[PDB]
Design an enzyme around this catalytic site. Structure first.
Site, PDB file in Angstrom:
ATOM      1  N   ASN A 174       0.793  -1.231   0.000  1.00 52.90           N
ATOM      2  CA  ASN A 174       0.000   0.000   0.000  1.00 52.90           C
ATOM      3  C   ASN A 174       0.825   1.281   0.000  1.00 52.90           C
ATOM      4  OD1 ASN A 174       0.987  -0.130   2.587  1.00 52.90           O
ATOM      5  ND2 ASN A 174      -0.912   0.562   3.571  1.00 52.90           N
TER       6      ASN A 174
ATOM      7  N   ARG B 193      -2.692   7.366  11.701  1.00 52.71           N
ATOM      8  CA  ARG B 193      -3.716   6.886  12.641  1.00 52.71           C
ATOM      9  C   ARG B 193      -4.428   8.093  13.246  1.00 52.71           C
ATOM     10  NH1 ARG B 193      -2.919   1.858  14.804  1.00 52.71           N
ATOM     11  NH2 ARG B 193      -5.145   1.997  15.350  1.00 52.71           N
TER      12      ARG B 193
ATOM     13  N   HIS C 157     -11.780   5.938   4.979  1.00 49.16           N
ATOM     14  CA  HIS C 157     -10.460   5.328   4.954  1.00 49.16           C
ATOM     15  C   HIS C 157     -10.227   4.471   3.713  1.00 49.16           C
ATOM     16  CE1 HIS C 157      -7.343   2.365   6.611  1.00 49.16           C
ATOM     17  NE2 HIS C 157      -6.733   3.523   6.436  1.00 49.16           N
TER      18      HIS C 157
ATOM     19  N   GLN D  66     -13.166   4.229  14.047  1.00 50.16           N
ATOM     20  CA  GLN D  66     -13.163   3.948  12.619  1.00 50.16           C
ATOM     21  C   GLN D  66     -13.813   2.586  12.386  1.00 50.16           C
ATOM     22  OE1 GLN D  66      -9.786   5.315  10.181  1.00 50.16           O
ATOM     23  NE2 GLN D  66      -9.505   3.184   9.568  1.00 50.16           N
TER      24      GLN D  66
END
Length: 351
Positions: free
Chosen positions: A119, A257, A305, A286
């Site tokens: 990622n 975060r 996200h 989240q």
């Protein structure tokens, strides 16, 4: 030997037919069904993963491999592991294994692995995008368009070029380094803080300067980019006091975060104007509840996200998962960096 492979993903519904390369969903299922079936394996795919009566619970007793993603995770509790007669392998099609009881997996002799590093470009690009969105003041412009308005002054008074600005990344791991490489041609004053200084040559190529003392770096920055893990040290570090030390009008980008920020401290400093803009795709909690305050605060450029689930990231996740399945069937080791637990042995970082 024929294996039973279970994949748990969310339903993408019509989105999966609009884009057949949307692999991280039930409908397309990593694009591995034809291959698994050709090899004589069973592939069971479901989104129904919660409750005693859910589809997943029907297969836990006899599956060999369980695959899921952090976007719709199949929680692997000690309770579930104890019920699983044949389970050997837990794969994350992505990065993240917080939904797995790793100690229980280790005790049960399991292997747990993920697609390490897949990622990083995605997140770096997304951070750079947000730096521009905040600096150049895109959001108020976009919002005028939709509202039938045309008020140049209301946009220009907080719109700057990125050229010449001081940008600091808090953390220079893989993502931070890719970011710095993409920032180089913009002609900024690049600063970075990290436990580990980059090589002189890499500092020269990016033009990035190492700032050993984080408290020295922060007040100099027009833009601060968060690129560190959430720890006891970093948890809520961006509180009222620290935010107060930042440049008035500082722009903050956070795809790391959410809890690295004190949630309310950010809201307060955005309302007063001390933070000029806040943009990121990570939240606490989240998924973000409907009433999450960061949704409604001034100058926010948030999204859900998703920076690490672009189609290109998903293709890498699917390819890495297929590679590990093939290796599992053939009795070959995975790439070392992919292991979280290997045959009951928890990697030292995770102890």
């Amino acid at each position: 030997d024929s294996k039973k492979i279970v994949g748990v993903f969310y339903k993408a519904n019509e989105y999966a037919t609009k884009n057949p390369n949307f692999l991280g969903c039930v409908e397309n299922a990593l694009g591995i069904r034809d291959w698994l079936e050709s090899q004589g394996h069973q592939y069971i795919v479901t989104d129904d993963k919660e409750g005693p009566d859910c589809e997943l619970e029907k297969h836990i007793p006899d599956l060999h491999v369980l695959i899921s993603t952090p976007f719709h995770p199949a929680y692997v509790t000690a309770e579930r592991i104890k019920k699983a007669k044949n389970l050997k392998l837990l794969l994350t099609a992505g990065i993240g294994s917080d939904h797995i009881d790793l100690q229980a997996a280790a005790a049960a002799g399991l292997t747990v692995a993920e697609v390490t590093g897949s990622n990083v470009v995605s997140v770096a690009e997304d951070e750079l995008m947000r730096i521009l969105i905040l600096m150049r003041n895109f959001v108020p412009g976009y919002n005028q368009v939709v509202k039938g308005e045309w008020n140049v002054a209301g946009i220009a008074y907080r719109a700057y070029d990125l050229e010449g600005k001081t940008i600091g990344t808090v953390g220079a791991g893989r993502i931070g380094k890719l970011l710095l490489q993409r920032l180089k041609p913009f002609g900024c004053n690049l600063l970075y803080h990290d436990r580990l200084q980059m090589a002189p040559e890499l500092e020269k190529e990016t033009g990035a300067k190492f700032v050993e003392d984080l408290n020295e770096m922060l007040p100099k920055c027009d833009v601060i980019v968060i690129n560190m893990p959430l720890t006891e040290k970093t948890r809520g570090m961006f509180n009222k006091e620290l935010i107060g030390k930042l440049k008035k009008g500082v722009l903050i980008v956070n795809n790391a975060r959410g809890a690295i920020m004190e949630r309310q401290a950010v809201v307060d400093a955005v309302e007063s104007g001390h933070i000029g803009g806040y943009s990121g795709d990570v939240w606490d909690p989240q998924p973000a509840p409907k009433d999450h305050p960061w949704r409604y605060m001034p100058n926010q450029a948030m999204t859900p996200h998703t920076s690490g689930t672009t189609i290109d990231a998903q293709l890498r996740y699917a390819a890495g998962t297929k590679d590990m399945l093939e290796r599992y069937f053939k009795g070959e080791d995975f790439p070392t960096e992919n292991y979280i637990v290997k045959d009951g042995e928890l990697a030292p970082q995770y102890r």
